[PDB]
Amino acid sequence: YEHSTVMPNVVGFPYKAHIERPGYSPLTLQMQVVETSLEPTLNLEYITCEYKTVVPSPYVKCCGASECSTKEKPDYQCKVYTGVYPFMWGGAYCFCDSENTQLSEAYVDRSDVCRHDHASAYKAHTASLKAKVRVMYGNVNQTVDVYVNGDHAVTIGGTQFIFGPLSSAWTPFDNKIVVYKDEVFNQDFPPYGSGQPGRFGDIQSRTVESNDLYANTALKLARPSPGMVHVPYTQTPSGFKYWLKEKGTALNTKAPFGCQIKTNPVRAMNCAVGNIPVSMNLPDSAFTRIVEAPTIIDLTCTVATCTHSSDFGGVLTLTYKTNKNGDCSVHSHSNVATLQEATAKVKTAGKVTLHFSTASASPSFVVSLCSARATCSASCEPPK
């Protein structure tokens, strides 16, 4: 049988399907979601941390020129200054006046603490939805994990279940995100190779261990005024350390729809968004049909006690007669009240106690038992 309902995406909401059939009633089906997990597929774009700026000993040569070479270090510079340390009192003990030269150079390395303290910038791509639904119909209190796409399928009690594509494509994560510690940020970080100086991503490395590193910190060599052999410069201080003030508006601060943003896998637990279309292929054996099912007669419904708007304040009992013992499927045909249970062990005695929830002073509602039905009423007030 091709049963198909559309339940709501909300944790701890007990759904009840009951779309009927010739032959016999639809074994009242209970199912509710235990947890959501909206997880986006990430591409680690790069790593950034603060930088350790590196400056070799300068190379001086009296009465003779130095020539700069290309080097493949990050943010690498070298300039050959001329006329730097005039005479021997000029600061290098050189003979010539102008004709002395200094090759000055520098480059940026990954901080000495980058493995401990750093961030990851991800491309967060189309997210897969994962549930942990507990299904209940007949004799199964079995629970299950399943992708809430239109594709994946699970057997439960020999019944196929497919929890369809979510009715909403919403996500709290943007096209680009950034993770630091246990927090995540929606952030348009600069791409690898184009990080700009003094702001986030000034240094970029594919991974942390990755040996390669793109740096742009406006590292600017300067001319050594006569005084001592040295190598001065004008860099821009890390944008990582700068960004640790612009880190703040984290997603886990704001929980739209009760989302819980958790760290190690980037995700959104128990987000209450949208409906879950469900579809299932029940075999005929899953039903307990009427020629085989027990006939009950003289079905009546008394209510012992009841509370206004509690979790399950109601306490009703059903008197009846049946030809033999079996397994019925109780269910209310009036939204004004709902039953804690959806099945009951019908004995020969003629007495089945049920518990139910409501939110009315004087409700009237049609309770069924197997194929039989009856009407129930009571007076109900709330506690302090």
Host domain of residue 186: 41-126+174-253
User: Domain of 345: which CATH number?
Assistant: 2.60.40.350
Distance CA 274, CA 128 (A): 14
Examine the fold and report which residue of 290, 308, 341 is the final residue of a domain before the chain moves on: 290
Asked whether the beta carbons of 256 and 192 are under 8 A apart, the reply is: no
CA angle 252, 253, 258 (to 5 degrees): 65
Q: How was this structure determined?
A: X-ray
- Is residue 289 helix, strand or coil? coil
Distance CA 5, CA 26 (A): 13
Are residues 341 and 201 located together in one domain of the fold? no
- Is residue 6 helix, strand or coil? strand
Q: What are phi and psi of 241, to 5 degrees?
A: -65, -30
- Is residue 257 helix, strand or coil? helix
Are residues 114 and 182 located together in one domain of the fold? yes
Are residues 179 and 122 located together in one domain of the fold? yes
Are residues 35 and 96 located together in one domain of the fold? no
Examine the fold and report which residue of 232, 253, 274 is the final residue of a domain before the chain moves on: 253
Asked whether the beta carbons of 324 and 353 are under 8 A apart, the reply is: no
Alpha helices in the chain (DSSP H): 239-246
Are residues 241 and 329 located together in one domain of the fold? no
User: Domain of 149: which CATH number?
Assistant: 2.60.98.10
**Per this entry, what is the length of the chain?**
384
Are residues 218 and 282 located together in one domain of the fold? no
Are residues 280 and 159 located together in one domain of the fold? yes
The number of beta carbons lying within 10 Å of the beta carbon of residue 76 is 15
Alpha helices in 185-272 (DSSP H): 239-246
Q: Give this entry's resolution in angstroms.
A: 3.0
Are residues 216 and 96 located together in one domain of the fold? yes
Residue type, 364: S
The full 3-state SS of 88-148, as one line of letters, equals HHHCCCCCCCCCCEEEEEEEEEECCCCCCCCEEEEEEEEEEEEEEEEEECCCCCCEEEEEC
Are residues 219 and 202 located together in one domain of the fold? yes
Distances (CA, A) of 208 to 49, 120, 259, 352: 10, 9, 30, 66
The residues, any chain, with a CB within 8 Å of residue 230's CB and separated by 6 or more, are: 58, 224
Kindly state the DSSP code that residue 205 receives in the 8-state scheme.
Answer: B
Task: Please write down the long-range contacts of 379-382, taking CB distance under 8 Å and 24 or more positions apart.
Answer: 379/306, 380/306, 380/307, 380/308, 380/313, 380/314, 381/307, 381/308, 382/307, 382/308, 382/309, 382/310
Distance CA 161, CA 135 (A): 10
- Closest by alpha carbon to 377, among 368, 369, 366? 366
- Closest by alpha carbon to 325, among 295, 304, 298? 295
Residue type, 35: E
Q: Give me 143's structure tokens.
A: 């629970």
Are residues 135 and 18 located together in one domain of the fold? yes
Are residues 201 and 343 located together in one domain of the fold? no
- Is residue 372 helix, strand or coil? strand
Distance CA 281, CA 89 (A): 95
Q: Give me 357's structure tokens.
A: 């929830």
Examine the fold and report which residue of 197, 230, 253 is the final residue of a domain before the chain moves on: 253
Are residues 76 and 191 located together in one domain of the fold? yes
Distance CA 246, CA 46 (A): 19
Instruction: Domain count for the chain, please give it.
Output: 3
The number of beta carbons lying within 10 Å of the beta carbon of residue 253 is 9
- Closest by alpha carbon to 131, among 40, 30, 36, 14? 36
